Amino acid sequence: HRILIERQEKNMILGFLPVLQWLPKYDLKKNILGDVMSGLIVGILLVPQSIAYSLLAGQEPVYGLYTSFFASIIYFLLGTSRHISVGIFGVLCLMIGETVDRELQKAGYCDKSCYAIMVGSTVTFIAGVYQVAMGFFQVGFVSVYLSDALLSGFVTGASFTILTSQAKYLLGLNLPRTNGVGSLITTWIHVFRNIHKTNLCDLITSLLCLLVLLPTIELVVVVAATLASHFGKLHENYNSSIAGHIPTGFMPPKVPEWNLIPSVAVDAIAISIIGFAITVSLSEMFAKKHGYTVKANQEMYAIGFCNIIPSFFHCFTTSAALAKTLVKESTGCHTQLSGVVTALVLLLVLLVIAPLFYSLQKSVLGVITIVNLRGALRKFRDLPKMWSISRMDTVIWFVTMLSSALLSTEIGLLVGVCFSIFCVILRTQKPKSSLLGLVEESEVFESVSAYKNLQIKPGIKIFRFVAPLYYINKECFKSALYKQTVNPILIKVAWKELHTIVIDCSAIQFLDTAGIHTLKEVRRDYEAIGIQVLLAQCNPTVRDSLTNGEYCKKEEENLLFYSVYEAMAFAEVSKN
Amino acid sequence: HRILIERQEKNMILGFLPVLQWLPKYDLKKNILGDVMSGLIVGILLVPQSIAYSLLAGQEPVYGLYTSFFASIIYFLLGTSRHISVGIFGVLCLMIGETVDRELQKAGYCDKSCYAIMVGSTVTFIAGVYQVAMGFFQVGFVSVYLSDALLSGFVTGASFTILTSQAKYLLGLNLPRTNGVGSLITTWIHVFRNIHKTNLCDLITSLLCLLVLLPTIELVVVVAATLASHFGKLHENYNSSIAGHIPTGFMPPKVPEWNLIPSVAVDAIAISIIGFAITVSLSEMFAKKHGYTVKANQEMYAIGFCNIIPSFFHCFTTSAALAKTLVKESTGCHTQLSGVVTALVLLLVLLVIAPLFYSLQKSVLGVITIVNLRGALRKFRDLPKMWSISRMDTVIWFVTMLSSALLSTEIGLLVGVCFSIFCVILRTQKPKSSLLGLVEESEVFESVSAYKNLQIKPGIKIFRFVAPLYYINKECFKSALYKQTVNPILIKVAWKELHTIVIDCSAIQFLDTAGIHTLKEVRRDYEAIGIQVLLAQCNPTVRDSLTNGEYCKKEEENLLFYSVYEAMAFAEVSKN
Ligand SMILES: O=C([O-])C(=O)[O-]
Ligand SMILES: O=C([O-])C(=O)[O-]
């Protein structure tokens, strides 16, 4: 009556540049509206964003505009997604500024501003080739190790570090630069220490900008603030911080200095990883939004060469925002030509009307940065909902947040990745394990601890262990099996109803050397007392591992079964 | 015809000192033989072992004897296992010497020998309190993270570092001390560089000792070597290395200097972990050998206080050997009183007949250390057998070996622990997934890729995914499900036989937020084409996660089933 089942016998140019085949398919009438509106809006919007993040990264306004313009042009010539906005990312520029400050401290501070670019571009050039190499060799699976609950706590914690850093500009204080682990608390300490020396004009204008922009517009706010700062001596009479002169034109291209490659490679690893994890994602999510497909390898290449050709022209790393991909969505663009228009607008700003924002203050720039972190720092209102869905994901999110906001961004990403992997390990150990009962008028065996009125038979116990059996939870497996049924060691040492134990191995995913040893020891110990142990519903991998580990002899039979019902039927017959 | 199952409603002194109750139960006639033989043999055997490992740890002979004697006495007064030998461990002394050398270099070299003890005892005192604290708070589960394939590659790699270090003494060379990552290759480089300056007498005696001891005795070899070295001017005429004067008596107890606590704590973590992992183990394995039980918490306490009271008297860390637990096994001791005799013998050596080994050379000590690493360095002959049982365990063992033998011992244990956890992660990702077929004249569904003649029905496909569904393997789950059956995205974008898909969730252990989202997306995408997706055999945890994640509405039914047979039956009826 045993179940008998037999085992089975033991186009390169076209791909590189999407626009080669995308231009003929593009229709001017189909994609006309939104492209013109996006170019001026997104472009005028990326001017403040650029001047600010450049100061966040440790540079001047000109280089932020360089990065944005070159990123847009390169992605248009190389990208595949029809809705993504490749430009400056706040978190990436924060990490760039951290590395730039570290190397500046190492060197000691070719002006100091010039040396920032050499470090800044070199980090980006290494980040780009890392993205190119991992894309070419098809080693892009490393994205699977960064979840959406770690890459949403890293961006909610790094948003506090960007708002703390900007708190200097909002309050009009010339605070010293703070770096390393614990920079957030130290900067706040300096803020409260020097709060008496805050500029009255800077505080007034920052309060007005916060009270206007937050309820609400960004472009008109920038225009109004610049106009108010102009036609006045507040740069001297009020001694308020001013953006200053923005150099015009394009400087000659400079090859990144290869003297700094070994120092900047380690940070470039994190830069490239987050840059492709946060792009290939919002490029796939938006592709699913509009019902089209995006090539992950082509995104790899596009975001890789977006950090090399710009890197030759004094630019830092570029990545998709999803904080300005929404501005261009609201615009209504239906093609990547809009970005070109944006680039054109940036070009129209880069050499022409460049000193028009000379009088623009820094407090307004900080306020603009503040009213754009709203999204990430509002992820707090979703905490109870996250707790309801999954408590461990909530814990991982909070740990990543606290680590990134208090122990540097890079250490706060490595703490997130490792903690998530250990949380999976923690889920494996101390797992669910319970007896099973028979469902009346059926052949289904379910947990007698989760379902009621489950019929069980005296003398036979069915034990289910959900997790895989390996070195981590072998002791837990033995302890649970002994807590249920009987403890063979205790009965043997005491000697010196129950007669059959069935283990349901359906949920066991794999077996380690310790797991094979644990199963053999369990069977031998129970057989010493006079109990027979039958394994049921072992997957083919577990069956092969047991056969390789010599759990049973070839001549021996009546030991492994394909179903719990078959094992129960065999045990009842043997007792008779 | 659906299965309807209802869910269930939502003695302190006696324990501290085993000898209080073990002495009255002890019988002199029952445990008489072996105790006397062990004391002299194990004791005379622990004299060379002590003088050598002390030089391995960076100290003089007197302190090794201190450590061995005090460890034996303390474990007799506190230990529970009746067969374990608590004394000096080669790997532990190697790590102690590494930390001692690091602090010696930091300070710069109270004689230099005296400062070694202050660092040596302080490391041990912190290691002991860590074992005491983790035992008292019942946080001893940390042992589960060190497998028997990592703690057997760490001890096979650290055995090469001990044999390389001893290669200096075998060849009679005064090589400089090498430390840090890559010390093994550097020391071998120095050996080959200075091979021309090797002592002829030291080489001759080391070759003779190697050719005699290895085929075979250790005690008589020590006696013969000491006698040959005595009554001769080879210490001067041949300029051979000599152990030297061993101080007699007991020095006054010295409290460990608390100035070095923060520097030595990090190494003390590894010292305490390996010390209790390699003891509670060979104390449980030997207990199972002789059919008795050992209290893990009492072992925690005994091995913890074995590193505190000795630590007050110029002693370093103590741990069970299982390299001299076999010598005392062969003796035939049946109680812990034998260790006391050993301690007595050590005492008889510590103040009396101490200069009897003054003329003993160091080459013979190195040879004795060499012919005792045989066990760990013979674990190479078991490599093919390990490969047959489990390839991943073999890879973990080799990686731990290479890391410990080439990148320091502590880094080689942390590399082993992390790689094993990632190997479990690697086992989860890229897992097994295949279609299932129906077994004829039964109700068992098995893989159609592993079993032959499995009947399947057109229009209905049963898909099994072995691993848990979470952020790491969500993309793999979607890709596998699309490779089998049909790819809903491609059919939808093309439009712009198969009609039912059953997913067997029996092997799925848990579901992450990404897993719940992946399942919902899969169901929606297939329902768009016109395919119905039914989940079957979901464990109660997965069912609760789906209910919490709002996978199905309360009013909605015919979506989750308790068995694949029930799901198949329902699908056939619906098609009719
Ligand atoms: O969730 C994400 O990936 C993010 O926001 O960066
Ligand atoms: O396997 C072990 O635990 C050892 O030998 O240390």
Residue numbers in the entry:
A (entry chain B), B (entry chain A): 52 to 61, 87 to 185, 212 to 318, 335 to 614, 645 to 724
From the paper:
SLC26A2 is a vital solute carrier responsible for transporting essential nutritional ions, including sulfate, within the human body. SLC26A2 is known to function as an electroneutral anion exchanger, facilitating the exchange of various substrates such as SO42− and C2O42− for Cl−, hydroxide (OH−), or even with each other. Like its homologs, SLC26A2 forms a domain-swapped homodimer. Each protomer of SLC26A2 can be divided into three regions: the N-terminal region (residues 1–104) comprising a few flexible cytosolic helices and loops, the transmembrane domain (TMD, residues 105–540) with 14 transmembrane helices (TMs), and the C-terminal cytosolic sulfate transporter and anti-sigma factor antagonist domain (STAS, residues 541–739).
We determined the structure of SLC26A2-C2O42− without NaCl to an overall resolution of ~3 Å. Surprisingly, we found no experimental density for C2O42− in the canonical substrate-binding pocket between TM3 and TM10. Our model shows that the C2O42− substrate is likely stabilized via interactions with the side chains of adjacent Ser residues, as well as backbone carbonyls from L253. We mutated the Ser residues and carried out the cellular transport assay. The result shows a ~ 40% reduction in transport efficiency, confirming the importance of these Ser residues for C2O42− translocation. In addition, we performed molecular dynamics simulations to probe the dynamics between SLC26A2 and the C2O42−. The result showed that C2O42− remains bound for ~65 ± 4 % of the time. Notably, in all simulations, the C2O42− molecule does not enter the exact binding pocket that accommodates Cl− and SO42−, implying that the substrates’ transport pathways might not be exactly the same.
